[PDB]
Amino acid sequence: NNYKKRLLGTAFKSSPFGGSSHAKGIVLEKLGIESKQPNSAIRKCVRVQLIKNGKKVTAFVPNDGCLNFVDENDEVLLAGFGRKGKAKGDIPGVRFKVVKVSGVSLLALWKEKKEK
Amino acid sequence: KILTGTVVSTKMHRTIVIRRAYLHYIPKYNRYEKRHKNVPVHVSPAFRVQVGDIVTVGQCRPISKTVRFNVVKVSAA
RNA sequence: UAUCUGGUUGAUCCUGCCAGUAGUCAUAUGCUUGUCUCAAAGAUUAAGCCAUGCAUGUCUAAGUAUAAGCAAUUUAUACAGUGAAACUGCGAAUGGCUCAUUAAAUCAGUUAUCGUUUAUUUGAUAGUUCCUUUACUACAUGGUAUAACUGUGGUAAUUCUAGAGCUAAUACAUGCUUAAAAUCUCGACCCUUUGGAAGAGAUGUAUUUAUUAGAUAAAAAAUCAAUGUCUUCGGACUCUUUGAUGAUUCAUAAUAACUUUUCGAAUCGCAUGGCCUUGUGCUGGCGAUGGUUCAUUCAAAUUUCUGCCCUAUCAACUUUCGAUGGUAGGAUAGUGGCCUACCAUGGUUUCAACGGGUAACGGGGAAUAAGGGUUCGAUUCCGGAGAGGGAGCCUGAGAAACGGCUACCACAUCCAAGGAAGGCAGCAGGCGCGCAAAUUACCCAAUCCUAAUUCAGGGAGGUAGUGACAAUAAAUAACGAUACAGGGCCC
RNA sequence: GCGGUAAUUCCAGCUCCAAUAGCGUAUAUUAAAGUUGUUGCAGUUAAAAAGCUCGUAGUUGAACUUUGGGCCCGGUUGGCCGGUCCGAUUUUUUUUUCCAACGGGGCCUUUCCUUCUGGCUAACCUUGAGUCCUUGUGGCUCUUGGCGAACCAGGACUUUUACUUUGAAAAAAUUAGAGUGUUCAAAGCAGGCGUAUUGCUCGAAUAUAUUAGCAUGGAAUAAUAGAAUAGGACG
RNA sequence: AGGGGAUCGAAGAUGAUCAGAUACCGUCGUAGUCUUAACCAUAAACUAUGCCGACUAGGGAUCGGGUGGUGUUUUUUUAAUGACCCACUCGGCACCUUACGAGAAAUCAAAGUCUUUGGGUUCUGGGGGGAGUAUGGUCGCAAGGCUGAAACUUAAAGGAAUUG
RNA sequence: GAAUUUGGACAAACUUGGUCAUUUAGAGGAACUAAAAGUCGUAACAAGGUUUCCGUAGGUGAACCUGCGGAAGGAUCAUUA
RNA sequence: CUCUUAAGGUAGCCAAAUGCCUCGUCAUCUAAUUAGUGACGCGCAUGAAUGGAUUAACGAGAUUCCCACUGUCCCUAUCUA
């Protein structure tokens, strides 16, 4: 007998933690990032504090016309786009990624749906 | 019951320490696994021999704070 | 149910990831939402906190009810059937909710209790109690004490509760009974000794010691000192026989004495006709509430044996008395360092002690397996453990208790400012928490459970509501048709 | 990787593809992954030999000791029904016509299985009376002397394990899987005949029980111990 | 820490050289280079290839042992022997040159054998970086050694080969 | 019993200090990473224009240079073949 | 790039017992800080045996804190020779 080895490890304790299908949290600032090499654009993202851990994270309002939220107050749900321990990403260091809110998002919808 | 082992610790007036010597298998192969738990002797009378050597012994009644098996006859010499 | 695919180059072969790609016991969220049957569901976050309403109480004969001021009917008179409510007696130690701890005999499989308690269902029983030596508080029945009830009162207020008067019992006390002999210790006197002797005392069960019997693997005799049975009186015992289990001091039998002393039937219900002598006496016939000591299963408790996820940036661990053991004792229902004392240094460890970690309850089993394996576990079922934290207790057969108290720590409510209350990790329901989980509904019908001979009770359980929450099905069209055909088919 | 006016990747229409009462998206995991590898990896340069030897724990370690020959009863697969080897069937005929192989128990050979006291059977040595019939060793009634280990039980002794074989015992649901038209299915453990005034009738299987324990049969592979100054070994 | 102290020669100076020279080219010269008693325990510490035993195929060449000895001389008046020395062997050495078989290649007498176990063992690896850094403990006088992360961050870095 | 109370054994909890394990604040300091490039100088590659790397030791504006002693993972300028 | 005197402060180190402005600026300790301490640097005017930086222990050495203690004090009062 013998021998245990490396790779994926037990110890955890990250930043959304709940491996959450999101993370509710209020919309601290509206920081439209800026594209990485090769591609190039003003990558409209959003910074917010996670009600849960309070911990602050910033992620792409990724939609296509929807800094509709952009409510410094209002509270999205964020939620990572599995890279996993990485970002996509034309979009430079953004970890998780915008979700739904003010709690309720297509993200565009009720009534109609607009687009994006 | 009734078991065996090789007497480990002589000194302890009426309480040999005798080592019984399991050997377990498992999945991964199973050849190498040389386990060995140690248990206490006894205890209420006398007559016997010393370290090394293997005695019988057989579950006495809870004879003393975990020393639960008195020595029957000395199998090894 | 054995498969790979796309991205380093100019092109190329190799490692190696990264990324697609499938199933979830992974929940969540996004849109969308017709029917069917099957229904998971506030555990993950916070065993965090809780408004209010619920959740456990039960009695056929059953121990207890009364002469018109407990009385709902109506004649069984010296207490009827009827009941309230009270004492009784059982029950609340089931269940249901939850996993916080927990690296453990937790749990799993296997073990035994010559190492112990057990209410209760069950199978089983017990003529000996005063005797002081007939006129024994009596066995044709022995004191009481009390609830409810009545009135007399107090306090903001609680399941508050004083003081005064009544009455019950299978309640607390109480504590009578019945046979006949059997050998035992006293030995008055026999006025013989190779001993003989009456009557009068002891007895049951439990409990305390302390003693003996428990037979036995082979088969035969001499010996005390004590002591039996028959005798042709010299002698002889051939007259017995005792289980059970591997393993006994066992079970069960005695001999001495012994205890703030156990046990034996005070209750009740059908059922009033038979024996012969006229209230009588036996008769109590049937069932049931019992009480004693055995095992009987319901169980509990400890208990061997082998298994316990990461970690060495955890290698030495355990003694202020307990860590190993030995005596002896104290406790226990009972082993044992369980706790005391006295005495000895022991016991574990690299075959991984010890220590650290667990977003750790264990095991059923769950998911994706060509196989081999990874990964998962608190929905059900077993076993455990806890009802805010933490101790300590009364109750009892059974609890260290949740829906019981007591104190502390913690929250936190009504106050006439005095004081009085509480525990939703049980249903519902709220707050909070978060990614994350429904209703203040109906019911005893089923399944069963709890209380005594009924049919009482039960957010155990079952129905509904909510809910594509995972699953089985499966309509949103079916015909040929009429002709327009653009033409395709053997040319 | 797309997008720097003519965009096969944005936006939007048309159309079309995929699955469909269901599809995303997140996030774990499991597979793919022989990228954590006992099966079953890699290590000269690609990630990966320690500078050098020592050497404790651990893990491993040459070959030798019982063979090889002979005899006796066996049924289950088989060449057709069958207790059956010169044939009772599967053959070309105007006779000669092949038996397999599989495993098991017992006993012979320089070959104790533990056992003395001795306790039974049904088996043999074999004959006191007899035999059946197909050519008497194709069959067994029979009791005179008289088998060893089955075999109980006191009483005297035993060298210690691995492994491997059936076995017992302890859970239900869970899963594997028999049974049956739940309308099929998922399930359920129901159900099925009729002859309908108290009728009949089958079920509710098996399987897996994996480590340790117990109980067993085996003596290949691997340990263990024994007679060396003889403190051997019997009766 | 002491002894000495030839040479060269970190630091350090200056001489050229450069746009710029703290260098590379001179030349002095500290330490050091040597030494003894004591530390340090790293290296492209190499053969970048673990140790043990097998088996798998040819030839040549340089170390101990066997024989024929022949070849020329010792030992000498000569033989022989002796010394080297030649030829056939074997042993074990360090190495070279070419098939099956292995590999991504290059190459490999193993880097060989086994579908894809298999003879026993020690060791290390699991995309790059972030790094042999942070922290801890130990070792040391010091310099340092030994042990040794994670966050985050990227999709390529990397071998061999082939052509420009 | 109630009062009441002597000693005990349990034993909450109070205080004060210790010890673990788990988090976490901070002037500033010093890395890194996104980094493709802006600016200085050319270290590596072509004997990269001083062959290159290995330690180790000094010195540096940055890359570096130099000193001992390795390795070719080489200079093939070739005393040997 | 420069003009420039031997040389043009090297390691190291601070508002320090040297710092002018200075009560330096940021933290940190306070209810509060011209004090303390920790930082940061063209430091009037720090700096290498004028010795530079460290440093166990030692200190009737200078400073600032905390605990205990206390008539120091609030707020004074009484007793003895």
Curated annotation (Swiss-Prot), chain A:
GO molecular function: structural constituent of ribosome
Covalent cross-link Glycyl lysine isopeptide (Lys-Gly) (interchain with G-Cter in ubiquitin) as placed by the record, residue numbers: K30
Subcellular location: Cytoplasm
Keywords: Cytoplasm, Hydroxylation, Isopeptide bond, Ribonucleoprotein, Ribosomal protein, Ubl conjugation
One GO biological process term: regulation of translational fidelity
Record-level GO cellular component terms: cytosol; cytosolic small ribosomal subunit; ribosome
Chief location category: cytoplasm
Keyword presence, Transmembrane: no
Remarks, miscellaneous: Present with 10600 molecules/cell in log phase SD medium.
Functional description taken from the UniProt entry: Component of the ribosome, a large ribonucleoprotein complex responsible for the synthesis of proteins in the cell. The small ribosomal subunit (SSU) binds messenger RNAs (mRNAs) and translates the encoded message by selecting cognate aminoacyl-transfer RNA (tRNA) molecules. The large subunit (LSU) contains the ribosomal catalytic site termed the peptidyl transferase center (PTC), which catalyzes the formation of peptide bonds, thereby polymerizing the amino acids delivered by tRNAs into a polypeptide chain.
Family statement drawn from the similarity comment of this UniProt entry: Belongs to the universal ribosomal protein uS12 family.
This protein's name: Small ribosomal subunit protein uS12A
Organism encoding this protein: Saccharomyces cerevisiae (strain ATCC 204508 / S288c)
Curated annotation (Swiss-Prot), chain B:
Processing and modification events after translation: N-terminally acetylated by acetyltransferase NatA.
Domain of life: Eukaryota
Cellular compartments annotated: Cytoplasm
Single GO MF descriptor: rRNA binding
GO terms for biological process, alphabetical: maturation of SSU-rRNA from tricistronic rRNA transcript (SSU-rRNA, 5.8S rRNA, LSU-rRNA); ribosomal small subunit assembly; translation
Record-listed cross-link Glycyl lysine isopeptide (Lys-Gly) (interchain with G-Cter in ubiquitin), residues: K11, K28, K37, K65, K73
Record function comment: Component of the ribosome, a large ribonucleoprotein complex responsible for the synthesis of proteins in the cell. The small ribosomal subunit (SSU) binds messenger RNAs (mRNAs) and translates the encoded message by selecting cognate aminoacyl-transfer RNA (tRNA) molecules. The large subunit (LSU) contains the ribosomal catalytic site termed the peptidyl transferase center (PTC), which catalyzes the formation of peptide bonds, thereby polymerizing the amino acids delivered by tRNAs into a polypeptide chain.
Assembly mode: Component of the small ribosomal subunit (SSU). Mature yeast ribosomes consist of a small (40S) and a large (60S) subunit. The 40S small subunit contains 1 molecule of ribosomal RNA (18S rRNA) and 33 different proteins (encoded by 57 genes). The large 60S subunit contains 3 rRNA molecules (25S, 5.8S and 5S rRNA) and 46 different proteins (encoded by 81 genes).
Note from the entry: There are 2 genes for uS17 in yeast.
Protein name, UniProt field: Small ribosomal subunit protein uS17A
Organism listed in the record: Saccharomyces cerevisiae (strain ATCC 204508 / S288c) (Baker's yeast)
Gene this protein is translated from: RPS11A
Residues of the whole record sequence present: 69 to 145 of 156
